[PDB]
Structure 1
Amino acid sequence: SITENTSWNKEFSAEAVNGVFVLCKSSSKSCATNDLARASKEYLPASTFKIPNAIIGLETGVIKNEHQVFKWDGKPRAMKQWERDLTLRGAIQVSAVPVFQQIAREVGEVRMQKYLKKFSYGNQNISGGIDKFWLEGQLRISAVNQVEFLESLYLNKLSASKENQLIVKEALVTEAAPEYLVHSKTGFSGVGTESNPGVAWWVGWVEKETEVYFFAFNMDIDNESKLPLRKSIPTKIMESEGII
């Protein structure tokens, strides 16, 4: 079903980046990628895990409803941008790791395992601690699997209420225009080492007029200055494809 577009490599070789972009028009049955081998290779999801984690938090009642406020206790957090009260959309958009570590703790291992099985989420390996498995643990997911998962969310076909899927979808909106709407989420596991790099992601979908395009990007990253390429490489490819 998946085809290779070697012209998309221009955008990767120019920045000396080892990565993959998977782009699907209408459904995950019609996908194209720059690298067929890397398209199914599995990596730590990092903050892209906030999408299933938010759905699970709502499903289990850990997150009361769409208007739940996650209060800051005034005690130090890793990022200044996290040192404030956040809505569910705010906590997803600023990628507030401690908010989601607390949700994962409240969900617990049994319920987390059950939902990742329901969602067919990567290797479904939640070893490495309940509040760390997606950051430094054993959980791995491919770009192809991210697209399949996002397509299910878009269609309200995940094993969750349509209401909870709709709440998480509005939380994912990053661009809005009269005939163009983007839902997306970034991820970054850190810079690792040279030989064992970290991973950076950008996943989501574009609704342009009456068409839908699902996408998932990942790349090896050992230098934090390369981080914006997680959005600029996929954007340049979608621009060359006329999606914009």
Structure 2
Amino acid sequence: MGSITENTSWNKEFSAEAVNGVFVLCKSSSKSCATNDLARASKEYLPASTFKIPNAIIGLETGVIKNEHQVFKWDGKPRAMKQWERDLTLRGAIQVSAVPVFQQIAREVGEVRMQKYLKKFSYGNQNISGGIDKFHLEGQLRISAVNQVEFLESLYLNKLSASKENQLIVKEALVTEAAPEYLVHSKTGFSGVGTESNPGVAWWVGWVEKETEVYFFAFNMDIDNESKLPLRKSIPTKIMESEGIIGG
């Protein structure tokens, strides 16, 4: 991005919910970003399930994921969530953030190839230690809100070191809201509830194609109570509504 500025007026949406967090919002045409908190926008957190984005791309590139119509079959064995115990498309596996599906993808990719792609994508601190299947969730990988929007911008422009076809496939799998004036592409993440003194993190990252403009966004918050999880969409949604971007 070209520039960033602090805009403390969005803070009302955070303080109304007693939330500690950050929103980064970038306008494509101007290359300019605004955040409520410049310091936090640069702080690096576990990507949790937002890692499913580069994971999906890498799985495609390596041929671990065959094509966009790949069905990931439930093997029948009891999974960690009820919603994962079923056959899933790529979009399906992305949306229920099916840990087991993506853990298997990452296993098949392997450390060497995973590290190569993460380096090429300039994705986070690029540190993959703690298990080839658990590094993003309870291992060492860390990424900032600013790095999330830069990465998503490169994905939007097909600029990642991956085929255009594979980036297109992932971009469509990420569609989460369609309106006549705008398309929202997005991904949630949630590391867990941590402790009160060491909270977990919740994310919502993505971009809005709005008429001929595009807006890149990344939100994160401290979270110690699963009841607060819906705020990870509601705060950035209210901000984007107030910005005249969505709602619409």
User: For 1:13 and 1:209, how far apart are their aligned partners in 2?
Assistant: 31
**Distance 1:138-1:132 versus aligned 2 partners, 3 A rule:** same
| Contact 1:27 1:214 (C-alpha < 8 Å) held by counterparts | no
Distance across 1 between alignment mates of 2:30 and 2:139: 28
Q: Which moved more, 1:43-52 or 1:5-14?
A: 5-14
* 1:28 positional shift: 8.3
Question: 1:32 maps to which residue?
Answer: 34
Tell me, in whole angstroms, the C-alpha distance in 1 between the residues paired with 2:225 and 2:163. 40
Cα displacement string for residues 134-191 of structure 1 (whole angstroms, at most 9, x for unaligned residues): 0000000000000000000000000000000000000000011222100000000000
Pair 1:28–1:55, CA change in 2 (3 A): farther
Task: Provide the secondary structure at the position in 2 that maps to 1:130.
Answer: coil
Task: Select which of 215, 221, 224 maps to 2:223.
Answer: 221
Specify whether residues 72 and 117 from structure 1 end up closer, same or farther in structure 2 by C-alpha distance, changes over 3 A only: same
| Partner SS, residue 55 of structure 1 | helix
TM-score (norm 1): 0.99
Whether the 8 Å contact between 1:191 and 1:198 is mirrored in structure 2 is yes
SS in 1 for 2:23: strand
Q: How many angstroms apart in 2 are the aligned matches of 1:37 and 1:29? A: 19
Alpha carbons 1:28, 1:214 under 8 Å: kept: no
1:1-244 matches, within 5 Å, as: 1-26=3-28, 29-244=31-246
CA deviations on 1:20-47 (whole Å, 9 max, x unpaired) are 0000011683000000100010000000
Distance 2:197 2:125 in 1: 23
In structure 1, list runs of 5 or more residues that go unmatched. Answer: none
Greater Cα shift, 139-148 or 28-37: 28-37
- Does the 8 A contact of 1:71 with 1:85 survive in 2? yes
Runs of 4+, deviation exceeding 6 Å: none
Q: Secondary structure at the match of 1:44?
A: coil
- 2:193, 2:224 within 8 Å by CA — same for their partners in 1? yes
Q: Check conservation: 2:145, 2:218, Cα contact below 8 A.
A: yes
Question: In 2, distance between residues paired with 1:96 and 1:28?
Answer: 36
Once the two structures are TM-superposed, the CA of residue 103 in structure 1 deviates from its matched residue by 0.2
CA distance in 1, matches of 2:244, 2:107: 43
Q: Tell me, yes or no, if the aligned pair for 1:27 and 1:151 is still in contact at 8 Å.
A: no
Q: Structure 1, residues 92-148: CA drift from partner, whole Å, max 9, x if none?
A: 011111000000000000000000000000100000100000000000000000000
Give 1:16 deviation, angstroms: 1.1
Secondary structure of 1:17's match? Answer: coil
Tell me the TM-score normalised to structure 2 length.
0.97
Deviations, residues 21-80 of structure 1 (Å, cap 9, x unaligned)? 000011683000000100010000000000000000000000011111100011101111
Contact 2:204–2:233 under 8 Å retained in 1: yes
SS of the equivalent of 2:112 reads helix
User: For the Cα contact (< 8 Å) 2:46–2:136, is it kept in 1?
Assistant: yes
Identical columns (%): 100
- Tell me, in whole angstroms, the C-alpha distance in 1 between the residues paired with 2:30 and 2:149: 7
> Are the counterparts in 1 of residues 29 and 213 from structure 2 also a CA contact under 8 Å?
no
